[PDB]
Design a protein around this ligand. Structure first.
Ligand SMILES: Cc1ccc(-c2noc(CNC(C)C)n2)cc1
Ligand SMILES: Cc1ccc(-c2noc(CNC(C)C)n2)cc1
Ligand SMILES: [Zn+2]
Ligand SMILES: [Zn+2]
Ligand SMILES: [Zn+2]
Ligand SMILES: [Zn+2]
Lengths: 359, 359
């Protein structure tokens, strides 16, 4: 059976299971069941399933090199699908809540969930909450007597928290740390002294890399009972690296990719985002350019936003990007190499992820 | 050591642990640490700790009748405190998010967390997320090799989901189920055909009773390894009952308790809440009263809200309340009785909860 076909089938099974359990154990009525079904489809379907499918692809890899009965192969593949869906639903949770937090308009060329006329922020905050509880209902039901249950839940829990800590670093990234105070409305930074590579790297690592890269790879290993074909410090380093690279590209596209293709009008300039472009720009600008940057950044006035774009184009950031890219390629290949010692299968799955990321 | 003193001490220890782990493992900086410390104190302290302290009080009960070394007594009491705090933090999560959802103004005579000038909805949604992840960080750290870890996490997870399902029943309680549709803005009900005792009881059971009553009692039993001194169906029924009673009283106070004492201006009338008062009023009104109810309910126009209050006063709802109260007292005492078979200690703790609730 092809992997996508399995993964999509498992969605319909898990949806049926969750909705049926609401009826049999939570006294739900059909109209509310239908609301949550539509919620689930609208927030969880329609992407490329990179994160979910990685869990499946990692598991498929170990299946080729490990002796198993047929029924075990199926159980492993089914576990990989459910685990994959746990990450997609985790992602959907974060996307629903982030869009509300940020006052976002569109997501995947369609309106954000909270904007749907019969949803509203009042319901959508809680719909996002339910998405994440669904990930745990899946794990407890499907993996009830799996040996990996404890480790899986512990990992998931750590990644979730990292993500939320990351979101916090992200939403406060235009503030001066020394001014943060729940009592005092927060001004945007004037100096941009916290627009550094290290500070940037901290936001992306917590906000994105743990749930996008670390979680699917390690979940793959857990459902395959293969945590011992790898050096966990290595899997960490390579994920944080591929993950960083991922965010550099979406920081670049937020700026220089028409809103048609982005599936979203970019507002990193006007949100005064600590993006790779602003940081890298500030690491190479002369004094007159830094002053012009500061006079325009974080302003919706389209004219000021077109000034920030001008400065980035002028400053030749594509050269910095290709330099970054060359170094990331170096480091990723070296890490892949170090992964091949213990597992060529796992190293090949990390190679396949990095490819999809790069292209 | 007195129980409150222990419980508050354990707060300072758990706060220190969580903040220290952010620094040592999540690369946090001191100013963000201070933000989250203030967040934690402002959202989690200041209440009566009924839910948290019940876990402690249940555990104290079994300590009197069970042979244990001193070090075990302390470990059990310490576990009860941490578990208690897991419920307070769960509650804080729900209060932070509900206040945002509902556009609430005050909570405990102080502004809702999201209203604080240096917070904003953008941060407060995520602060609420962190509150709930903190409950899991506590459990995994403090209860890492406890035999009850699995059961505790499973229970907590079920209660959390129930609560979120409950919130959903609550936020959609003024809609007609047959009209719910994420595509179509939701009108308030015209007929009030879903303002029934059964429908009311469904909202309160999911929204409140699981986290407020079931969770503290069962968590008490789990940390005491005493799940076998009770009949779990009984503990369920008595909690759902005391819990329902709880909501009937706060539905009454939302209306007839000055905002000074409530710690919050009530808006159940103008939110068109399925409260006990509206339901009970509709179960006894004549046709002219139902029509007047319908012409005023769910409207901020204070004059219309004063009409709804008039109708409730006229309709003699206090008599219905005392009738309800007499029946709840009957049923609770009968359940206590059925609990005494297996455990007089547990039955006495359920007696102590019901007292605090009643008074
Ligand atoms: C585990 C994992 C996670 C994310 C990705 C990924 N995300 O976006 C892309 C493709 N973005 C190109 C088309 C610009 N690949 C791949 C693997
Ligand atoms: C386990 C648990 C949970 C809640 C309560 C409770 N809540 O509020 C009150 C007191 N409300 C009176 C002063 C009107 N008792 C008690 C025990
Ligand atoms: Zn965001
Ligand atoms: Zn972006
Ligand atoms: Zn509410
Ligand atoms: Zn209320």
């Amino acid at each position: 059976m092809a992997s996508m076909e399995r993964f999509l089938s498992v969605y319909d099974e898990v949806q049926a299971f969750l909705l049926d359990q609401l009826q049999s154990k939570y006294e739900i009525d059909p109209n509310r069941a239908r609301y949550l079904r539509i919620m689930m489809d609208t927030t969880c379907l329609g992407g490329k399933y990179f994160r979910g499918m990685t869990v499946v692809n990692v598991a498929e890899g170990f299946l080729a090199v490990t002796q198993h009965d047929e029924a075990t192969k199926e159980r492993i593949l089914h576990d990989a699908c459910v685990g994959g869906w746990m990450i997609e639903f985790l992602q959907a949770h974060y996307l629903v809540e982030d869009d509300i937090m940020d006052g976002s308009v569109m997501r995947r060329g369609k309106p954000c969930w909270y904007r749907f006329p019969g949803v509203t922020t009042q319901c959508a905050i809680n719909d996002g909450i339910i998405l994440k509880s669904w990930t745990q209902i899946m794990a407890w039901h499907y993996f009830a007597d799996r040996p990996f249950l404890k480790d899986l839940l512990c990992l998931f829990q750590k990644v979730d928290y990292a993500t939320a800590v990351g979101q916090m670093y992200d939403v406060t990234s235009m503030c001066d740390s020394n001014k943060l105070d729940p009592e005092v409305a927060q001004p945007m930074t004037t100096d941009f002294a916290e627009f550094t590579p290290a500070i940037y790297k901290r936001i992306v690592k917590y906000k994105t890399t743990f749930y996008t890269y670390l979680l699917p790879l390690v979940m793959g290993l857990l459902v395959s009972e293969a945590a011992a074909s790898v050096e966990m410090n290595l899997v960490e380093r390579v994920a944080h690296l591929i993950g960083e690279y991922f965010q550099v590209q979406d920081d670049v596209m937020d700026c220089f990719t028409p809103p048609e293709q982005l599936g979203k009008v970019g507002t990193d300039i006007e949100d005064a985002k600590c993006s790779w472009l602003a940081v890298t720009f500030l690491g190479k600008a002369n004094a007159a350019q830094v002053a012009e940057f500061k006079a325009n950044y974080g302003e919706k006035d389209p004219a000021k936003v077109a000034v920030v774009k001008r400065l980035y184009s002028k400053a030749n950031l594509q050269a910095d990007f290709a330099a970054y890219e060359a170094e990331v390629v170096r480091e990723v290949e070296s890490l892949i190499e170090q992964l091949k010692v213990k597992s060529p299968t796992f190293a090949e799955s990390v190679a396949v992820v990095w490819e999809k990321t790069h292209k």
